[PDB]
Scaffold this active site. Structure first.
Site, PDB file in Angstrom:
ATOM      1  CG  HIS A  61      -0.077  -0.112   2.690  1.00 53.05           C
ATOM      2  ND1 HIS A  61       0.126   0.971   3.363  1.00 53.05           N
ATOM      3  CD2 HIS A  61       0.241  -1.404   3.178  1.00 53.05           C
ATOM      4  CE1 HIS A  61       0.647   0.302   4.335  1.00 53.05           C
ATOM      5  NE2 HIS A  61       0.747  -0.919   4.250  1.00 53.05           N
ATOM      6  CD  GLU A 103      -2.794   9.703   5.938  1.00 53.15           C
ATOM      7  OE1 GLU A 103      -3.566   8.775   5.679  1.00 53.15           O
ATOM      8  OE2 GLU A 103      -2.210   9.608   7.166  1.00 53.15           O
TER       9      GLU A 103
HETATM   10  C1  VV8 Z   1       5.592   1.161   5.196  1.00 52.53           C
HETATM   11  C2  VV8 Z   1       4.894   2.407   5.705  1.00 52.53           C
HETATM   12  S1  VV8 Z   1       4.012   1.372   7.188  1.00 52.53           S
HETATM   13  O1  VV8 Z   1       4.969   0.467   8.196  1.00 52.53           O
HETATM   14  O2  VV8 Z   1       3.101   0.473   6.698  1.00 52.53           O
HETATM   15  C3  VV8 Z   1       3.161   2.580   8.221  1.00 52.53           C
HETATM   16  C4  VV8 Z   1       2.339   3.542   7.111  1.00 52.53           C
HETATM   17  F1  VV8 Z   1       2.204   3.158   5.988  1.00 52.53           F
HETATM   18  C5  VV8 Z   1       1.594   4.611   7.862  1.00 52.53           C
HETATM   19  F2  VV8 Z   1       0.882   5.149   6.932  1.00 52.53           F
HETATM   20  C6  VV8 Z   1       1.755   4.782   9.410  1.00 52.53           C
HETATM   21  S2  VV8 Z   1       0.969   6.320  10.132  1.00 52.53           S
HETATM   22  N1  VV8 Z   1       0.283   7.077   8.789  1.00 52.53           N
HETATM   23  O3  VV8 Z   1      -0.261   6.066  10.955  1.00 52.53           O
HETATM   24  O4  VV8 Z   1       2.218   6.754  10.618  1.00 52.53           O
HETATM   25  C7  VV8 Z   1       2.525   4.004  10.136  1.00 52.53           C
HETATM   26  F3  VV8 Z   1       2.780   4.191  11.302  1.00 52.53           F
HETATM   27  C8  VV8 Z   1       3.159   2.880   9.410  1.00 52.53           C
HETATM   28  N2  VV8 Z   1       4.337   2.118  10.339  1.00 52.53           N
HETATM   29  C9  VV8 Z   1       3.436   1.230  11.493  1.00 52.53           C
HETATM   30  C10 VV8 Z   1       4.442   0.787  12.548  1.00 52.53           C
HETATM   31  C11 VV8 Z   1       4.091   1.137  13.699  1.00 52.53           C
HETATM   32  C12 VV8 Z   1       3.516   0.020  14.564  1.00 52.53           C
HETATM   33  C13 VV8 Z   1       3.414  -1.327  13.629  1.00 52.53           C
HETATM   34  C14 VV8 Z   1       1.990  -1.291  12.815  1.00 52.53           C
HETATM   35  C15 VV8 Z   1       1.454  -0.580  11.472  1.00 52.53           C
HETATM   36  C16 VV8 Z   1       2.398   0.527  10.914  1.00 52.53           C
HETATM   37 ZN    ZN Z   2       1.617   7.671   7.710  1.00 54.77          ZN
END
Ligand code: VV8
Ligand code: ZN
Length: 256
Positions: A61, A103
């Site tokens: 994604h 966002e």
């Molecule tokens: C490669 C990006 S991610 O690890 O899938 C990820 C992400 F795409 C995000 F949009 C968020 S956000 N927008 O809320 O910052 C994000 F935090 C991502 N990483 C997390 C790692 C932190 C906890 C583990 C599980 C969910 C994804």
């Molecule tokens: Zn993000």
């Protein structure tokens, strides 16, 4: 399983992740007339070690850049925080059109894309995996990206994407300080919120920068040229990954 498409996107997430309809969901619209200034906020301080840059990964994604998080070499402090948070990642969100890829919005204004720089609470917790579900576990800096001039600071990142074209690919990504991507001033808004994609935990203290950074139309096209499929399957562009804004539910957005 979830995604950003009509069948599996934001409007559907609440079926498998009920917290989607919770009281501390992100992103939000920041209405500047309604922000409250908190005299206790301190300036944000970022102190990142370029030697912590580790790897870039296509996760289907989106894509992200990870940083070694075994120690406190690269940390965010200040702002609303009593102790330091450890850098672990940065990524972007974008949309199907330049008109709306951010966002977060400000006074209903949608930007073309948004940069997220993510950190976890290494004072209170011992791992990202422990911190991720805690109300005080994560801190994410968001920077709104306004379409216009090409941004040269994006170049290392965009140049790397050719190595991670399809889902699951990963490559080394080293010697990079992502504070180089932030605006010159770190004036900011802060509110308690959530991860913006499943599992949508309400674990994030958001730091949204007042100042935007630029991005060109062609740079955004490079994001959308990444593929969501696994290698060998028919190419499916990653056209969008931004969640709509969610109700404030009585939260206050604080201004620095
Ligand atoms: C490669 C990006 S991610 O690890 O899938 C990820 C992400 F795409 C995000 F949009 C968020 S956000 N927008 O809320 O910052 C994000 F935090 C991502 N990483 C997390 C790692 C932190 C906890 C583990 C599980 C969910 C994804
Ligand atoms: Zn993000």
């Amino acid at each position: 399983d979830w995604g950003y498409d009509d069948k599996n996107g934001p409007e559907q997430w609440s079926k498998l992740y009920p917290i989607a309809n919770g009281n501390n969901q992100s992103p939000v619209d920041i209405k500047t007339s309604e922000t409250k200034h908190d005299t206790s906020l301190k300036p944000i301080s970022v102190s990142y070690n370029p030697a912590t840059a580790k790897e870039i990964i296509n996760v289907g994604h989106s894509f992200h850049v990870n940083f070694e998080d075994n120690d406190n070499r690269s940390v965010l402090k200040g702002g609303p925080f009593s102790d330091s948070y450890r850098l672990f990642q940065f990524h972007f969100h974008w949309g199907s059109t330049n008109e709306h890829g951010s966002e977060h919005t400000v006074d209903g204004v949608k930007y073309s894309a948004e940069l997220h720089v993510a950190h976890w609470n290494s004072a209170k917790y011992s791992s990202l995996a422990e911190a991720a579900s805690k109300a005080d576990g994560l801190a994410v800096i968001g920077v709104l990206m306004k379409v216009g001039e090409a941004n040269p600071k994006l170049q290392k990142v965009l140049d790397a994407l050719q190595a991670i074209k399809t889902k699951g690919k990963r490559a080394p990504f080293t010697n990079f300080d992502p504070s180089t991507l932030l605006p010159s001033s770190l004036d900011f808004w802060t509110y308690p919120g959530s991860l913006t994609h499943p599992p949508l935990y309400e674990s994030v203290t958001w730091i949204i920068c007042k100042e935007s950074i630029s991005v060109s139309s062609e740079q955004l096209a490079q994001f959308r040229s990444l593929l969501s499929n696994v290698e060998g399957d028919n190419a499916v562009p990653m056209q969008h990954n931004n969640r709509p804004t969610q109700p404030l539910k009585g939260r206050t957005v604080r201004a620095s």
